């Protein structure tokens, strides 16, 4: 009796499994706008933004799926379409080295300057913005 | 030299521009940021907000990269891929066969139909929620 009747029993879980996965992927959309929501007739606007959820959550899930399917080739390809931008980013790798090289000591200063200077550097930015045609006329005077 | 001043000139109008190409990208994060907050310290948690769903637009510009891709053989990739979950895929294909012919000439018919299937349908998933683990039951007891 009792291998026969805990038989039938999880073909009920493989069905609650079935509601948990559906009811785990509804409640995303509900943590998430808790934050993202709060930060930024209701019915249709809450439907069309659990949807678009949902397309997130399939495209991590297609994103993760995809990489786990080719587990070099996909590295090497991204690579082709660097060989005209690599032009650039062969020209950023030694920035980078030297970088890398000063890396401990400059990376926790900037880390130091980027909770204070960071938001200096949301103001500051917009002097960047009419600074950029400044520089133009520099470059053009050069 | 007047000459050099109109050709040193282009430069700084294409620099602006690439200005505005950068400025017109952080305006999508915005915009996005906007329409979020529309359908629901504040400073750091729209900075956040703001860094992560820029970080969704490099996503999502990888899943463009995928439409790219095929500029049959991007399909056919896709289709091996699928052969671990054609195991189960094999019986939505029938299914999709089906539909794949019918729902172009449909879709026309389509787009007035999903104005009225979405009040229906979600009186409908009401019930068909139960009903779904029933039917997955069933399906276990076959």
């Known amino acids: ?11 009920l879980l493989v069905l609650q499994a079935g509601f948990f996965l559906l009811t785990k992927i509804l409640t995303i959309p509900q943590s998430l706008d808790s934050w993202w929501t ?5 019915y249709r606007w809450m439907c069309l933004r659990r949807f678009i ?5 399939l495209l991590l ?8 399917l080719d587990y070099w080739a996909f ?4 690579w082709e379409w660097a060989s005209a931008r690599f032009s650039w980013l062969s020209l950023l790798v030694p920035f980078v080295q030297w970088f890398a090289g000063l890396s401990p000591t400059v ?6 300057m ?10 500051i930015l ?3 913005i009419p600074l950029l045609p400044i520089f133009f006329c520099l470059w053009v005077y050069i």
């Open 38 to 42: 709060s930060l930024n007739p209701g």
């Open 126 to 128: 917009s002097p960047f």
């Open 107 to 112: 990376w926790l200063s900037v880390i130091w």
């Open 1 to 11: 009796m009792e291998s026969i009747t805990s038989g039938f029993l999880g073909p």
């Open 53 to 57: 959820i949902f397309l997130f959550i």
């Open 114 to 123: 980027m909770w204070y200077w960071g938001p200096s550097l949301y103001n």
């Open 61 to 68: 899930c297609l994103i993760f799926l995809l990489v786990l």
């Open 75 to 78: 590295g090497k390809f991204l």
